[PDB]
Amino acid sequence: FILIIKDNIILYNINDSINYLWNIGYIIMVVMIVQVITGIIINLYMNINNGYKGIIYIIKEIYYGYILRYIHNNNSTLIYVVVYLHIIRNLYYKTYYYNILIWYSGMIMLYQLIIIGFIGYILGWGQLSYWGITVIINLISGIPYLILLISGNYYITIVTIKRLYIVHFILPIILIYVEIIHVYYIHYLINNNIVEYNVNNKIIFNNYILVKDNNGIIFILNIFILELNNNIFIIADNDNLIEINILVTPIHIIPEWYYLYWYSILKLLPNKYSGLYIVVNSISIINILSEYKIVISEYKNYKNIIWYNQIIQYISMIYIGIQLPIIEYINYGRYIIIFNILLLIMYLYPKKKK
C-alpha cells in the first residue's frame, strides 16, 4: 500500500487558493487518532465497576495519569469544536451542492460521534452522568419493554455501564473506517475552492499543503496545551464530581457544552416526542438543502445572510440551554425554533421567474 499512499499524499493535487478553513479536516483526523490512543491507554487502569473511583485512582496513583485523564476529556471538547467548525465551513461555501456524497459520508460520522461522546460522558459515573442518561432514556419509554432491554435492569446500574462501555470502545473504531470513505470521496470528487469555478492551479499536497496544515495544527496545539494544563475555559461541569445519589437530583441536569443545542430543543417544546422529532429534523433537514434547486448555480459567494443568521441561531439556542427553565426563556426559545424553520425553508425553496 505504498503506491496507494503515494497517490493520495505525495502526488495528490489541490488548488493553491484554499484558505486555512480547508485545514480543519486534517485537524479532525489527527485529534481523532489521539482520542482513540489515549482511550486505549486509559482503559489499562480504569475500573468499570466504579467509574468514580477509577478516575481518582488514575489522577492520583498512576504516573502521569492526570495527562491521560485531562487529554481525553479536553480533547473530546476539541473534537466537537473542530467538527462543528467544519460543518459551519461546509454550510458557508455550500460544498454540499455538488459534493453531496462527501456530505453524506460526513453526516454518518457526525451521527456516530454523537453516540460516542454521550456514552463516554456516562462512564464518568457522577451525578450528571447518572441523571443525564436517566432523563434521555425515558424519551423512548413509549416503545414497550425497550428501556428494560437497554438498561439491563429497572434503573441504570453497572450492568448498563458494562454494555455501554463496549459500544464506546468499538464504535470509534468504526468511525475511523468511515473516515476512509470520506477521504475516498474527497479524492475522487475533487474538493471545492474559494471561487465557484474550477481552475488550473493545483499543487502537490506533501510539499505545500501538509506544511500549511502542520502550521495550523501546531497553532491549535498551542491553544490546546494551555487549556489542558490550566483550564482557561470551563468546558466540564463541576457537578459530575459529586457521587451518585439516586434519590436526590442535582441542581441542574445538563450535558456537555456540545450537546446544549439539542438539550434546549427538548426543554423548549411542550410534548416530549415533539422535542425528539425536532432534534431529528435539524440534523436530517440539512442533508437535502440543495435538492430542490433548478437553476444553474450553487448560490455561492453571495452575502450569505441566511447562513449567518443560522450560525447565530445555534449560538443563541446553546445559550438558552444553560439557563434555568424560566418561562420567558421558553417563549424566546420557541421563536428561535420558528425562525430556524423559516431559514431552512429559504434554503430549500426554488425560485420562480418574474
Binding site: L148, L149, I150, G152, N153, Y154, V159, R163
Partner: protein, 55 residues
Amino acid sequence: HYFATGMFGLIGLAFLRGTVVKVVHGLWPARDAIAAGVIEVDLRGIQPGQNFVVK
C-alpha cells in the same frame, strides 16, 4: 435439487434466528435482577396507622 438447496437455507435461517434472538435475550434483566425487582408485602402484623418503608 432446489428442495435440497432450499433445505440448506431453511435450516440455516432457523439457526440464525435462534442465535440472534438468544443473544439479544441476554440483555434482558438477568435472573438475579428480575428476582430482586419484586417485593411481596406481608400485610400481616401491620397495625392501623403504621407506616413502613420497602426499598
